[PDB]
Design a protein around this motif. Structure first.
Motif, PDB file in Angstrom:
ATOM      1  N   UNK A   6     -50.773  70.056 -30.121  1.00 18.14           N
ATOM      2  CA  UNK A   6     -50.349  69.433 -31.370  1.00 18.14           C
ATOM      3  C   UNK A   6     -49.065  68.636 -31.173  1.00 18.14           C
ATOM      4  N   UNK A   7     -48.107  69.191 -30.430  1.00 20.45           N
ATOM      5  CA  UNK A   7     -46.866  68.472 -30.168  1.00 20.45           C
ATOM      6  C   UNK A   7     -47.128  67.189 -29.390  1.00 20.45           C
ATOM      7  N   UNK A   8     -47.998  67.252 -28.381  1.00 18.97           N
ATOM      8  CA  UNK A   8     -48.325  66.056 -27.610  1.00 18.97           C
ATOM      9  C   UNK A   8     -48.994  65.006 -28.485  1.00 18.97           C
TER      10      UNK A   8
ATOM     11  N   UNK B 145     -36.893  73.555 -23.381  1.00 14.16           N
ATOM     12  CA  UNK B 145     -37.003  73.394 -21.929  1.00 14.16           C
ATOM     13  C   UNK B 145     -37.493  74.630 -21.182  1.00 14.16           C
ATOM     14  N   UNK B 146     -36.979  75.840 -21.429  1.00 12.44           N
ATOM     15  CA  UNK B 146     -37.475  76.998 -20.662  1.00 12.44           C
ATOM     16  C   UNK B 146     -38.984  77.177 -20.719  1.00 12.44           C
ATOM     17  N   UNK B 147     -39.566  77.213 -21.920  1.00 12.33           N
ATOM     18  CA  UNK B 147     -41.008  77.417 -22.035  1.00 12.33           C
ATOM     19  C   UNK B 147     -41.783  76.267 -21.403  1.00 12.33           C
ATOM     20  N   UNK B 148     -41.340  75.029 -21.638  1.00 15.65           N
ATOM     21  CA  UNK B 148     -42.048  73.879 -21.087  1.00 15.65           C
ATOM     22  C   UNK B 148     -42.055  73.918 -19.564  1.00 15.65           C
TER      23      UNK B 148
ATOM     24  N   UNK C 282     -53.308  74.551 -21.588  1.00 10.74           N
ATOM     25  CA  UNK C 282     -51.881  74.694 -21.859  1.00 10.74           C
ATOM     26  C   UNK C 282     -51.051  73.866 -20.888  1.00 10.74           C
ATOM     27  N   UNK C 283     -51.414  73.884 -19.603  1.00 16.66           N
ATOM     28  CA  UNK C 283     -50.691  73.082 -18.622  1.00 16.66           C
ATOM     29  C   UNK C 283     -50.823  71.596 -18.924  1.00 16.66           C
ATOM     30  N   UNK C 284     -52.024  71.152 -19.307  1.00 16.17           N
ATOM     31  CA  UNK C 284     -52.220  69.747 -19.644  1.00 16.17           C
ATOM     32  C   UNK C 284     -51.401  69.356 -20.867  1.00 16.17           C
ATOM     33  N   UNK C 285     -51.350  70.231 -21.875  1.00 17.31           N
ATOM     34  CA  UNK C 285     -50.541  69.950 -23.055  1.00 17.31           C
ATOM     35  C   UNK C 285     -49.060  69.868 -22.700  1.00 17.31           C
ATOM     36  N   UNK C 286     -48.584  70.786 -21.855  1.00 17.70           N
ATOM     37  CA  UNK C 286     -47.187  70.742 -21.435  1.00 17.70           C
ATOM     38  C   UNK C 286     -46.889  69.463 -20.662  1.00 17.70           C
ATOM     39  N   UNK C 287     -47.806  69.059 -19.779  1.00 20.21           N
ATOM     40  CA  UNK C 287     -47.618  67.818 -19.033  1.00 20.21           C
ATOM     41  C   UNK C 287     -47.594  66.617 -19.967  1.00 20.21           C
ATOM     42  N   UNK C 288     -48.477  66.601 -20.968  1.00 21.14           N
ATOM     43  CA  UNK C 288     -48.483  65.504 -21.929  1.00 21.14           C
ATOM     44  C   UNK C 288     -47.174  65.449 -22.704  1.00 21.14           C
ATOM     45  N   UNK C 289     -46.672  66.605 -23.138  1.00 26.22           N
ATOM     46  CA  UNK C 289     -45.401  66.632 -23.854  1.00 26.22           C
ATOM     47  C   UNK C 289     -44.261  66.151 -22.965  1.00 26.22           C
ATOM     48  N   UNK C 290     -44.243  66.590 -21.706  1.00 25.73           N
ATOM     49  CA  UNK C 290     -43.187  66.184 -20.786  1.00 25.73           C
ATOM     50  C   UNK C 290     -43.239  64.680 -20.553  1.00 25.73           C
TER      51      UNK C 290
END
Lengths: 29, 24, 436
Positions: free
Chosen positions: C168-170, C190-193, C208-216
């Motif tokens: 959702x964030x991404x 930052x820690x969780x990401x 989850x990893x793909x969502x984190x990568x998209x957010x980053x």
């Protein structure tokens, strides 16, 4: 993918044409 | 996808700033 | 919720709808009048079975006062459903935008009760996302302070909830204002990401990893954000590359490589130095060489990896182990350092940190003081630092002992004695060299 529009975004030509028209204020002055 | 979204402003705004306004 | 098709969205919708209660009982309990109960019933029959439309406004009003049953998470349940259900949520966001008076109330409708509605709040108040003009920059900025989003996205145990929140964030990054709000949230998240990618380094995990990568990547698209993050999450720059290298998914690897390249983008302030440091420390250049040797079917990922390899080559064309030494001195929480590899680099490094007069080494003195403060504890990083700082001090003192006086006056003898005082293994193991 609509990457072609990425090139089409280069003009955007009037953005500087209006600027030049305004800069014609120097000639007017 | 999002690369084109970024490139939209990366070109439309940057092009004028670096090639149009500097000619003033 | 435009991305409701995601399995996480389906789970959120199921959880929200699992607690639905009839409006007839609410009318009997006097929670709402006959008209309000009828409107709530119509909204329910629209969302999950004209229906809706004028309804679901009185349902939200009743849920504002009612604190259980469908009133608890009715908004979340309606949002989680697709727009095909009488445009529930999709049309509701536009209707709320047309009536700003209750807009805040609608924004306050979500993010209530248990996580079933807390996680859906990001897909409930902003279910329409940045599209259609329903939301605004101020709304995103205010919502970025909600702790429910942090609890959902960063939930280590709740893998599905974390993946849904990250997705959702991404997705919320469509508008630049939403992107700025997301970056503001990331500045604290930052820690969780970073931990998401660290875990990805070795089927909700992939999502989850793909969502984190998209957010980053979305946060890092702005050069200023990447430059600022380099000063706090520099190790994360190579951690993302390692996660991509381990990650086999083509799209996830492409996203990670794109984020890495954005970090090295010329727009990012100090792009050349940052790229050189990344290549020297995180082995981004050998990793890029391996990626070039490796093959993948993702053309976009291939292009991103090639760009990252070019950036790494340019960075390493003017690289030196002195940057790695500076980074290690900045860390001061490790067991070993690059200069311990052999006697070659140290031959100069002995006079590098000291600036030929120990002046530049005073930062090394502060690093050693911090490592000694941590040395009294038994933490693995604590013992590693206790050993490493003392070993570096011994190596530096072995040549040009003048600066040793500065260390001796600064508690060098006391520090050496305390390192070997007691309850230490590596600390004494390096204090022996320091005092020898």
């Amino acid at each position: 993918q609509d990457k072609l529009k990425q090139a089409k975004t280069d003009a955007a030509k009037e953005i500087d044409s209006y600027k030049i028209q305004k800069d014609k204020e120097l000639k007017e002055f | 996808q999002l690369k084109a979204d970024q490139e939209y402003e990366i070109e439309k705004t940057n092009i004028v700033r670096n090639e149009t306004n500097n000619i003033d | 919720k435009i991305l409701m098709d995601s399995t996480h969205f389906n789970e959120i919708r199921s959880i929200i709808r699992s607690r639905s209660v009839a409006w007839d009982a609410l009318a009997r309990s006097e929670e709402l009048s006959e008209i309000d109960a009828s409107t709530a019933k119509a909204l329910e029959s629209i969302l999950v079975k004209k229906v809706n439309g004028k309804t679901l406004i009185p349902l939200i009003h009743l849920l504002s006062t009612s604190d259980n049953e469908d009133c608890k998470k009715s908004v979340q349940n309606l949002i989680a459903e697709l727009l095909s259900s009488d445009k529930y949520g999709d049309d509701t966001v536009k209707f709320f935008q047309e009536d700003p008076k209750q807009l805040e109330q609608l924004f306050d409708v979500s993010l209530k009760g248990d996580f079933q509605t807390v996680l859906i709040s990001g897909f409930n108040v902003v279910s329409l996302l940045v599209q259609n003009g329903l939301h605004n920059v101020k709304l995103v900025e205010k919502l970025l302070k909600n702790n429910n989003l942090i609890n959902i996205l960063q939930n280590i145990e709740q893998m599905d909830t974390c993946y849904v929140c990250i997705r959702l964030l991404q997705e919320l990054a469509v508008i630049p204002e939403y992107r700025d709000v997301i970056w503001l949230h990331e500045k604290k998240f930052m820690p969780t990401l970073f931990k998401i990618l660290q875990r990805a380094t070795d089927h909700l995990g992939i999502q989850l990893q793909y969502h984190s990568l998209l957010l980053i990547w979305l946060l890092t698209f702005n050069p200023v954000f990447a430059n600022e993050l380099v000063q706090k999450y520099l190790s994360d720059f190579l951690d993302l590359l390692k996660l991509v290298k381990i990650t086999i998914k083509e799209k996830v690897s492409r996203l990670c490589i794109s984020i890495i390249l954005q970090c090295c983008s010329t727009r990012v302030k100090q792009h050349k130095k940052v790229i050189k440091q990344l290549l020297l420390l995180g082995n981004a250049l050998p990793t890029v060489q391996s990626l070039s040797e490796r093959k993948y079917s993702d053309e976009e990922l291939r292009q991103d990896i090639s760009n990252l390899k070019e950036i790494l080559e340019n960075e390493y064309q003017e690289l030196t182990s002195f940057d790695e030494y500076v980074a290690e001195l900045d860390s001061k929480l490790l067991c070993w350092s690059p200069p311990h590899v052999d006697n070659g680099f140290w031959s100069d490094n002995i006079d590098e940190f000291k600036k030929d007069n120990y002046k530049i080494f005073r930062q090394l003195i502060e690093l050693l003081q911090a490592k000694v403060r941590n040395g009294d504890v038994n933490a693995k990083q604590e013992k590693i630092i206790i050993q490493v700082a003392l070993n570096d001090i011994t190596h530096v003192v072995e040549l040009l002992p003048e600066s040793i006086d500065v260390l001796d006056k600064t508690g060098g003898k006391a520090d050496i004695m305390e390192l070997l005082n007691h309850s230490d293994s590596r600390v004494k193991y390096e204090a022996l060299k320091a005092t020898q």
